[PDB]
C-alpha cells in the first residue's frame, strides 16, 4: 500500500506550539535507498535532518513515506539531498535546516553529501554558512 | 499506587547552596516512556537534562515521579521535551537548562529533539544561543541496532 | 539493467581454488532489504553468509545482485533466511552454509534469523548441528539505536 | 486503543514453510517495561527471546502487542520471563525457546533472569540442559551505567 | 535507617510459582564495598550471583540490604564471597548457586574468588563440578584501568 | 586507622617543581561512595579532578584519606562535588580546576555534577567559562547498564 | 626500601576457613617487571594465577613484595611461570592451581607461558589434565598494539 | 644485517629446566609475511605456535630470524604452516606442537591452515588429534 | 613481477568522477612493512591515506603495489610517511591530502607519525592546519598487544 | 649492561629531511615504570608523547634507553611528565610537545598528569594554550580494571 515513486505530496505537518524559542529536531534515517541515475543500481544511506522550526513541524510517519517514495526512484546523490531539503523547506519554511546524507561508500569515496540553509535575511543565514563551513573541517 | 498521568505538581526543589558560581548538574534518564496522540502506541528515550542552578534545585525523587507521570500521557515528542523544560523553569528559575531526548525508532526513524533556555538578557541567554547555533555539528551514528 | 523481481537465475559460481581445503569464505551485506508481506512495509537487514566450498564458490558479484533483486519481494525474515540459503545450496553443493539476518527493528522488535546446513552424513551435518545447539550463547546488546 | 493489561490472547502464530530443518529465530525487544508488584513501580528490561520452531511461528506484530499488555501488569522480573516462555510455549509448541532478560538496576541491583525449555524426550531437552548448564559461564561487565 | 554492621537476617525470600523448571537468576552487584581486615581499608568489588531456585527465592531489596551490612565489616574477599554464598544457601535452599567477586585492585593486584555449590547427591552437585573443572578458562584483560 | 567522617584537615599538598609552566593533572576516582541525606542510603560515583596546579600540588594519599571521610558522610552529589572542589582550592590555590563527579542511578536517573573554578582576573577564570560553556556538548550513552 | 631480588621468603598465608569446598581465587597481576636473562632488557607481562585452595591461602601483599622481588631478576619467561607457580605450590599445598603469563613483545613476538598443577592421584590431577589438554583453543587476536 | 630467503639454521633451542610437568608456551607472530609461489604478491599473517615441551625450548630471538627468512621466499599457505611446524619439531622433538597461521583475507577466503602433531604413541597423538577436530568447529 | 625495491613509477591516476565535490577518498593498507635504516630489521604498520581530489584520484591497485615497494626499502618510519605523502601530491595535484602511520612496537615503543597537506593559499590549507593543531587529543589506549 | 638510574645524556638526535611542512610524531610507551619517592614502591605508566619537529628528531632507541633509565629513580608522576617533557625540549628544541602519562592505581586513584609546549611568541604556543584549555573536555571511562 506504498507509494515508491517519488511523491511529495505525502509530506504532512502540524503547528508548532512552541514559537518564541528556537529548538532543534533531528530525525535519523538510516534505512534509506533509491536508483543510481545511470547505472541503475541501488544506493543506500543513512540520512540526518536536523531543523529548528518557526511555525510547522513535519510529522514523523509522513516523512517516512515520503523517504520510501524514493525507493524505486533515480537522481544523483547531491540533488537527491537537495530534493529532499526543498521538500521540507517547502513543506515547513523553517528558520534552519540540514540534510546529510552517508551513502555506503564505493570506491574508498565516502560520498556524504551535505546541504542547509537558513531563513533569508536571518541571523540564520549566517548559522547556516558558519555550519557549512564547519562540515567540511571534520566530516 | 502511583500517579501515571501527567502531574507537574509533584516536582520539588531544595536550596543551592553554592549560587556563587555557576555548576552544571545532568540527569541521565534512561528509562524514559510516553504514548504518541494519534496511535496510543508507546514511545521510548533517554533524556539528558543539563542545568546551570540559580538559587533552587530540582530534587531527584521528584524528577523521578515527575517523568513517570507521562507513562500513560500522549504528545508528540517535541513538545514532551518543551514541556518538560518548561516544568523545570517553572520550578526552578535556572540560570540555564537544556533538555535532550534520543527516542527509539518508529517506522524506520528517530527523532531526537534537543531544547534549551538562558535567562533572558544575560551572559546565559547569550550561551543558550551558542549551545543551539552549535548543537550537534558532528551528528553520531545511528543504524537502530 | 537490474531485475528487482526475486531471481535466482543470476546466481554464478566458479571452481574452488582449494577443494583440498576447508576454508570459511566470507559474505557481508549491509545493505539488504525486501518487502513485508502483510503490510507492503520495507524491511531492512545486514546478512552474514559464510560456507565452506567443496567443487563451486558463488561468485561475489552475483551475489550482490541476487539480494537486490529482493527489493520488490515480499516474504517474511526467516523465510527469507531459508530462500538465501537453498538457492546457494542449490548453486553450489557446499560441504557447509550457514546465513544469518539481523533486521532493524519494527514496532520496538528486531527479529535475527539464523539458518545452518552440512552436507547429510559428512562431518559438516556434525558441524551445523553442533553450530545450532551453541549459536547465540551470548546475544549482542541492542537498544534499537 | 492498544491493551495494556496482560493479555496472551493476541499471540499470533503462521506456519513454518520450513519444517524439515532446525533454525533459529531471536527477537531482539529492548523497550519492555512492566510494573513491580509490591510498590507499583515501573520496571525496565531488555528482553531476547530466541527460539527453534516446529510448525508455528510467533508473529512479531503480535508479539508486540503482546509485550505491550504488560505495561501495567505487576510481577516480578523472574516471573515475568517464565510467563512469557510458557505463553510462546502453548502458542507454537516448539522444538526449542529460551527467555533471557536483563533488566535495568533497582537498589543498585539488577536481575538477569534466563529460563529455556527443548521439547521433553528429544534432543532438545538436552540443547536446553546444555545451555543451562553452560549458561553464563562469562557474565558480561555491568557497572550500572 | 540502614544497618552497615554484618546482618544475616535481613535477608528475605518468597515461594517459586515456576519449580517444575530449572531456569537461572542473577543479580549484578556493582556496588558492593566492605573493610580489609588488617588495615582497615575499604575494599570495593562488582559482585554476580546466579542460583537456579528449588522453592524459595530471595527477595531482591532484601539481598540489597544484606550486601549493604558489609560496608562496615571486615573480612578477606575470599571468605565474604563465601559468606554470601552460605547466607543465600540458608536462606534459600537452591538447586545451584555461584558467586562471583571482581574486587577492585590493591598494590596492583586485584582477586576475583569464584565459589559454587550444587544440591549434593543431584545432577546439580555435577553441575557444580562441571562448571568449576571450566571456569574462566578465557581470563580477560585486567590492564587497572 | 580510617576516619569515616568528614575531614577536610587530612588533605596535604607539596610544592610545585614547576610553576613556570602550565600543566593538567588528573585523578580518577571511581571508588567513591557516600551517603544520602534524607533515606540514609549509600550511593556511588566516579569522580573526575583535574587542575592546574599553581605553587602547591595535592598530595595523593592524602586524596585518598579525603575521600574516604565521605564514607559515612551525609549530602546530595551536588554539593559533594563543590565542597570537594572547595577544599581543594583552600588547600591547594590553584590556577584552574574542575570536579566532575558520575554517579551511578537511583529510581532509574543519575547525576552527574560538574562544576569548576579558575583564579579571579586571570586568564585562567575565562578558562573556566570557556570550559563551563562547552561542557557536555555531547552528553554519552547511558542506559543504566 | 623495598627489596627487588629474588625473595619467595616473603610469601605468607593465612588457613582456609572455607576447606569444606572446592572454590577459585583469581589474582590479575597487570603490573609485573623482569629482566631478560642473557640481555638485562627489562621484560613486561600481565600474570593471572588462579587455584582452588586446600588448608592454606596466599596473603595478597605478600604476593606483591613476592613478585616485586622479580623486577631486577634476569629468567626467560617460561621460567618465571613455573618459578612463581612451584613457590605457591611450595607456600601453599593447594588442590590446584595455573598460573598464565601474557609477555609484551619483543622483535615483533609475544610469550604466553601457561602453567597448572594438580594434587597428585587426586580429582585435581585429571582436572590438571583437563585444562592443559583443552588449554587455548581459540587463541585471542594478538596485533601488537 | 637479515638472512630473507629461507634459513632453518637459525633457529636454536635451550634446555627445559621443568621436564616433570605438562605446559605450554605460545608464541603470538603478527609480523609474519612471505612471497606467493604463483603471482609473487606478498602474504601477511599472523601466526600462533603453540608447543608442550619434552626437553628443548625454542629461544624467542631465533625464532624471529627463522620467521624473517620467509620474508623473500614463495611456497603455499598449507606447506608454509607445515615447514614451519617440521623445523619446530626438528629444532626441539616436543610432546605436542601446533601452528595456525590466520592470513589477511583475498575474496572472502580466510585461508587459516591449521596443522599439529603428538608424540608417536603417547597420549599427546590423541591430544593432537582431539584438537585438530575441535579446530574446524570454530575457527 | 613486483618491485620490491622503492618504485613511485608504479602510481597511476584516472579522473576524478565529481570535481564539483570535495568527498574524502579513503585507503586503508593494513600489511605495510619497509626496513629500518640502522639495523636492517624490519618494520611494519598500518597505513592510513586520505585525500580530497582536484582532477586525479589515485588507482587502488597500482597504490597497493607502491607500497608493496616499500618491503625492501631502507628508512625511518616519520620519513616513509612524507615520502608517500609527497609521492601521492607529485602524482595527483590533489585538494588535500593526509597519511597517518601506525607502527608495531620495537623496544616496548611504537612510533604513529602524522602528516597532512593543503593546496597553499586555498581553505585547503586552512584545513590541514586545523587538522594538525587538533590532531589526536585523545591518543587510544595501546598496551602492546 | 643498561642504566636504570636516571640518565638523560642517553637522548640521541637525528635531523629532519622534511623542516619545511609541520607533521606529527607519536611515541606509545606502555612499559614505563618508575619508583614512588616516599614508599620506595614501584608505579606503572602508559606514556604518550606527541610532538612536531623542527630540525631534529629524537631517536627511538634511545627514547627507549632514556624511559628505562627511570626504573629505579624515584619522582612523583607529575614531576616525571615535565622531566621528560623538559629534557625532550632540550634535545630537540621542537616546534611544539606534549607529554601525557596515565598511571596505574594506588589506594584507588590513579593520576593522569598532562603537559606541553610551543616555541614561545609563535602559532605553536598557541597550539598549546588551545590544547591546554581544550585538555580532556571528555574523560574516559576509568573503573581501575
Ligand atoms: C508519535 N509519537 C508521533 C507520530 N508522529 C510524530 N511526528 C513527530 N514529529 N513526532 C512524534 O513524536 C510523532
Ligand atoms: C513483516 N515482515 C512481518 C510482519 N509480521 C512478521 N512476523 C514475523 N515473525 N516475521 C516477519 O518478517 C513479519
Ligand atoms: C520489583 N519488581 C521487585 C521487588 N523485589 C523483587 N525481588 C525479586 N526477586 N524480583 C523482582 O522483580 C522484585
Ligand atoms: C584486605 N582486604 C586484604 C589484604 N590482603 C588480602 N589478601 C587476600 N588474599 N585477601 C584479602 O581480601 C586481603
Ligand atoms: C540522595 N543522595 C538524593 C536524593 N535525592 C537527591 N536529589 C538530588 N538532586 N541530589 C541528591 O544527591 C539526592
Ligand atoms: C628474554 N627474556 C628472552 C630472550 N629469548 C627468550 N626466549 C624465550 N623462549 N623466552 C624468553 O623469555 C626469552
Ligand atoms: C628504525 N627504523 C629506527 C631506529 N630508530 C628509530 N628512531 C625513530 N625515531 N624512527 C625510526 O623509524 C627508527
Ligand atoms: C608516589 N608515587 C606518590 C605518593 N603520593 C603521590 N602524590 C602525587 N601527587 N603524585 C605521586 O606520584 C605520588
Ligand atoms: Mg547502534
Ligand atoms: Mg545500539
Ligand atoms: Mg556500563
Ligand atoms: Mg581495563
Ligand atoms: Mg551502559
Ligand atoms: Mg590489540
Ligand atoms: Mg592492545
Ligand atoms: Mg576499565
Same mark, same amino acid.
Given at each position: 500500500? +506504498?507509494? $515508491? #515513486?517519488? *511523491?511529495?505530496?505525502? @509530506?504532512?505537518?502540524?503547528? !508548532? %506550539?512552541?514559537? !518564541?524559542?528556537? +529548538?532543534?529536531?533531528?530525525?535519523?534515517?538510516? /534505512?534509506?535507498?533509491?536508483?543510481?541515475? %545511470?547505472?541503475?543500481?541501488?544506493?543506500? *544511506?543513512?540520512? &540526518?535532518?536536523?531543523?529548528?522550526?518557526?511555525?510547522?513541524?513535519?510529522?514523523?510517519?509522513?516523512?517516512?513515506? +515520503?523517504?520510501?517514495?524514493?525507493? !524505486?526512484?533515480?537522481?544523483?546523490?547531491?540533488?537527491?539531498?537537495?530534493?529532499?531539503?526543498?521538500?521540507?523547506? /517547502? @513543506?515547513?519554511?523553517?528558520?534552519?535546516? #540540514?540534510?546529510?546524507? %552517508? $551513502?555506503?561508500?564505493?570506491?574508498?569515496?565516502?560520498?556524504?553529501?551535505?546541504? !542547509?540553509?537558513?531563513?533569508?535575511?536571518?541571523?540564520?543565514?549566517?548559522? *547556516?554558512?558558519?555550519?557549512?563551513?564547519?562540515?567540511?573541517? &571534520?566530516?
Amino acid at each position: 500500500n +506504498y507509494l $515508491f #515513486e517519488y *511523491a511529495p505530496d505525502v @509530506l504532512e505537518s502540524f503547528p !508548532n %506550539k512552541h514559537v !518564541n524559542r528556537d +529548538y532543534f529536531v533531528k530525525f535519523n534515517c538510516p /534505512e534509506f535507498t533509491s536508483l543510481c541515475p %545511470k547505472t541503475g543500481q541501488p544506493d543506500f *544511506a543513512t540520512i &540526518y535532518i536536523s531543523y529548528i522550526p518557526d511555525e510547522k513541524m513535519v510529522e514523523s510517519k509522513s516523512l517516512k513515506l +515520503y523517504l520510501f517514495s524514493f525507493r !524505486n526512484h533515480g537522481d544523483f546523490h547531491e540533488d537527491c539531498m537537495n530534493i529532499i531539503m526543498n521538500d521540507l523547506i /517547502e @513543506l515547513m519554511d523553517p528558520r534552519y535546516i #540540514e540534510v546529510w546524507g %552517508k $551513502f555506503t561508500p564505493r570506491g574508498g569515496i565516502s560520498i556524504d553529501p551535505y546541504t !542547509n540553509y537558513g531563513k533569508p535575511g536571518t541571523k540564520y543565514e549566517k548559522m *547556516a554558512e558558519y555550519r557549512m563551513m564547519n562540515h567540511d573541517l &571534520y566530516p
